[PDB]
Subunit: 240 residues, 6 copies
Amino acid sequence: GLVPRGSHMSVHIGAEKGQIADTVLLPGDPLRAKFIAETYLENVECYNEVRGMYGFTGTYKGKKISVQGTGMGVPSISIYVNELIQSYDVQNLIRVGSCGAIRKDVKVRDVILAMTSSTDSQMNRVAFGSVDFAPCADFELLKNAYDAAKDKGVPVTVGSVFTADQFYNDDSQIEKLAKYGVLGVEMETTALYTLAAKHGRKALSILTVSDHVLTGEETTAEERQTTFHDMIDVALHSVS
Amino acid sequence: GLVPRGSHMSVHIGAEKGQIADTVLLPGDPLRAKFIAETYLENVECYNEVRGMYGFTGTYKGKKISVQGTGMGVPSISIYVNELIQSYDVQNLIRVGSCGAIRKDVKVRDVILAMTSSTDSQMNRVAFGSVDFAPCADFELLKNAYDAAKDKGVPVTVGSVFTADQFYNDDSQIEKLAKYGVLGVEMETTALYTLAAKHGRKALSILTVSDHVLTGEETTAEERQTTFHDMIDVALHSVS
Amino acid sequence: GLVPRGSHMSVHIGAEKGQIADTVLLPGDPLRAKFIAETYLENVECYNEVRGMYGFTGTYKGKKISVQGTGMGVPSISIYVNELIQSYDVQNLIRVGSCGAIRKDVKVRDVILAMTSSTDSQMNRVAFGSVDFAPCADFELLKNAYDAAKDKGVPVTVGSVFTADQFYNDDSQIEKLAKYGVLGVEMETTALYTLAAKHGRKALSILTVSDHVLTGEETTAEERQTTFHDMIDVALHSVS
Amino acid sequence: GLVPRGSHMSVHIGAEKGQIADTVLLPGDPLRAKFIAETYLENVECYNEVRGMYGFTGTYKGKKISVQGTGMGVPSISIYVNELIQSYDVQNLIRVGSCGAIRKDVKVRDVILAMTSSTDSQMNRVAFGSVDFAPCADFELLKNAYDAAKDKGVPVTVGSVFTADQFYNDDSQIEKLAKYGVLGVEMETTALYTLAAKHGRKALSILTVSDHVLTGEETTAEERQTTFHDMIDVALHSVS
Amino acid sequence: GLVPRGSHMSVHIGAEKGQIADTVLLPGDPLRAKFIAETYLENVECYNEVRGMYGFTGTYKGKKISVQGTGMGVPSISIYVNELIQSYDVQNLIRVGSCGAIRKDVKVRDVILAMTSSTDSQMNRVAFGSVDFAPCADFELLKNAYDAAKDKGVPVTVGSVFTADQFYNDDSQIEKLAKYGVLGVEMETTALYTLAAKHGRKALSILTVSDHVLTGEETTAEERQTTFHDMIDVALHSVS
Amino acid sequence: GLVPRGSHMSVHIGAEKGQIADTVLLPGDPLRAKFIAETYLENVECYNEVRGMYGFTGTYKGKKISVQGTGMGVPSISIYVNELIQSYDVQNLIRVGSCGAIRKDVKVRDVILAMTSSTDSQMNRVAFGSVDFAPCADFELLKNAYDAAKDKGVPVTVGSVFTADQFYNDDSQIEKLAKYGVLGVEMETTALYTLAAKHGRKALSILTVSDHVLTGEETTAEERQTTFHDMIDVALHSVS
């Protein structure tokens, strides 16, 4: 190929049978996938370079864990999640990413566990028409993560998020969503939760606050990096 | 009035401030409201008879608790939940009701805790248009309920439900909903969860299975009554 | 059961074959069902106590008439109307209820006969998708009611209503509906008219004004009660 | 102009103030407008030739009546009805046209009076969004027409119709519409009823059967023409 | 018939096979169809008088060309285009009409070639539901028209238009459409392009400016008539 | 930062304003952006490494050109296009990518120029509601591309495409879209064309066939690489 190609079984992932673990962390940024795998895992290998969307496999306290970049937005993560599920038999899928907080009571240091997500994606209206489908986290994964946070005293907030198609949106309804108690905005959760459930696999999204969208309250690198480490510790402890 | 009238502040509830507790159990059937209050609570008073939609307040373990029938469907529960929240300052709202199970893996003895609900009600499209709003349980209540169930060894399943407008529906999508992991069908949760969140109150729906919609298999009175009691016990332990 | 159970053939109505008349009046309030049956009919029997949603049968000038509370909202009346039609072979279904007036020209003393109803329920979009279905009264019933009113001099207005899902609605379009000539808001007619037509039965909604929703002009008990009497007289004279 | 031009106040009608009566019959075919005016009215003048969409004014038993072709479809009739209402102060608008019957029980000789109409036009969703708006005939006009038919012994049916955007429609739902009681299909009524009501004017559609859509039962010229004459006689008598 | 009838094969066109050319110009105004045929073509015959929607066939530099009025709006043109395509085997369909300009940069003398059209017609949502279908001109016709205009120095602008259902529309989104680059508003192109494409025929809409919608800046007869002649010259040269 | 960060002015592009050209080629795959820049351009520098979404700038025959990976799907390309337009004042935006052909008449060697795109993205319904917005290519770029292809003898097809949200879609309407003349499926064009038009910039999507969706017929490496090189050659000649 002119550039790396996927496998016949997975057009966007150039891996073979067995190279991807049953449990996969899913950051949006493939360079964060790299950073996570190299910083937290042992015996790391890169199994995918197709489209520069790096995927890695290594071990955490003897258990195989993969870390796969998803890109941004429902259509991008849907491609990777479908291929992970259908071609690599992945069982547990945990997004680890950022969100923009939309309520003042959402604190910079809180690790957010998404129970569900609202969206302006049409993906579920395409499937259900007049039905509003509410995606749902796997409770076992969510509870294990909450327990991992609580056991250490890591601040954790459990609620809902909004999965946006338009990062830049002149027609945003973030103010109203915040009034209805939605915690923050990201670009992946609705797809991860819907596709995992449709195929009987377990999904969870863990998120940290990268900014406060409505107040412009600033975040610092120290705050963001500490909370990021807590997020990855929670994700890994919860599956251990 | 020709029949009992609501109060000026609450057109559908004939009570006065203080007569309803800050925690209210919400069965759909006002005769189950009566049964619950008289069976489980002490020193019970009926504070509402408007439209025969009985509401009661009594004592459980040193606190006042109320039990208010809601009727069936999003529009009916919305009227009672709005009035309880806005006129009686209710803080914790816990639906206790039945659902039709739509998956083989949902057992007759399972107490269901709804994380979220899908719907064919237009109530959220009316507010949000192109946005699919995903209603969300209060996790504090949900986790307390889960912990109460686990403490006794009551079987508990945590996931999503479908809030139907049409109990009889030629255009039902319950097969597809079940494929997407939805546990069962009921007629209230979307409204309870959306309105509680909009007003910063805490809600949870606890459900027991009254029938298996897709396999057709019937429940026994012994199965239903056992699980009903388990649901009420769990409910009475959902608020810290 | 712990509380009254429906019959096998009608989950929400605990009656047997023959106990319900072929002509049924449908107030929303089951206590008004009781008031109507006991005040206007002879030899009254209560055939349903399931969910406290009382239904009665008696005679009016030798004709059997039933009066069945429906509860509030499209989902609730849909349950009762489906069971009445499919399980008890009911032929004539006449709602007798209240509405909030939305036009200054609608007088508190006018009995309203609904030709059709607009709605924000999704029930018909669930069935028809891109089609806007316009529910339609049975003209024979409507004509007979109009003639009954005119023969005595009872004030009568014929036009359309709006069937709301949300009695409390921050996103109401009642101002625009009034500009388009809609008379008032209630919570049942769309379902009654659509379901009766689907099954080839005759329906009509007769309504009286409980409130002036936009002008804030209040109604008195004397006005409401006289007009209620006129409504029931029109319903019964019209079927005689 | 290269061809006849509308007036400054009415882009599609080349008339002056006063040339159009306050009561206007609205056939879809401008040649039927000519036929009706010439055959039924005295001292006929043609007030419009713009776009060949003929409009005429004459007298029937001394009352001024106009007959204006509308063309086919919601957008075409909307142009004429808006201009008639807004620029010529028209008060009573009565469509006289054809429909395709969609029920076996609709008889070829029955004159149809439309109480309301369903549609697949987006015109009302454009205005109301999540609301299904149900257009409504003026009851005074409808009742006058019904009484004129009964007085003259003309067979008459009253019910609802469907206003189609697509005369040829691979995605038609007319079989389902017929099951819900809809009598026939035409292409104008939703716009006439909605726009007349929006401006506080009176409208009615009277229709005769030109075709049996679902059965291909045949109609004859003699049947069609006799019933057409009945329709026009009903329209004119109802207005005098 | 009381007035002219269509043929059995084409309900709205009273012609026989062979009488209509494989290339048809489609003005909305049948009097403009007449003007075009009589002014530009030789040996003209009128093949249709049904509903006064005149169609003509003649020759231009020896080539058979038909000119068929369409009426206004998606439903009217859809009737004529369906019949032309399905009953008369028409291959090339070129609308020649007017539009209201919605941008300052669209000049009164510019001949507009529409690449595509937006709409508020539901015709494509009826077919595709959640999909936004974008109708597309045949590029060969478009390029031939472009080349014909350039050859003479006739000013030409290529871009998109908006096909409106409501010429008079209180809920218009013209301002937003102009911001997204849409050139003008007309009432036919979406239907023409969609139906031509569905049947593998070639379509193009050529348009001239009759009005500036947002500024009320005036056009004169001399401007409109000169540009009209340019439009017909481009259409005919382009098929020569 | 833990990984590369965007500029304050462009959250997802870590470049200084002067590092990006006024003309940007937009492949979905950032490794194809690398290949394009290294293969075709002189004096190449990489200006972005944020999220591994590489962007490069060099010269082609003396003209400054950038090549920026967009990722897959409307939300991803919308981020990059908004930042290019708003923060780097990019004027010409040309997607160079793959599509799945959906018609037998689309040949493997055909370079496709998209005039417009349909979609199942909700992005335009979010903005326009009841309006179907049809995105439009810049005709100047399209015509230059067409002219360049013809000059070289590269087979070119001009028509419409479908912008999918779901690469894997159980509810796909590909068969119907092909019937309506749509050429192929990709995941970016609607966003590119909509956002460029909204901001008065010029856009075009050029596409090559990666496979035949509906016949399973595969392409070969030699076919794909030949046509890729044709596409880039054409693109490098689309700006006037």
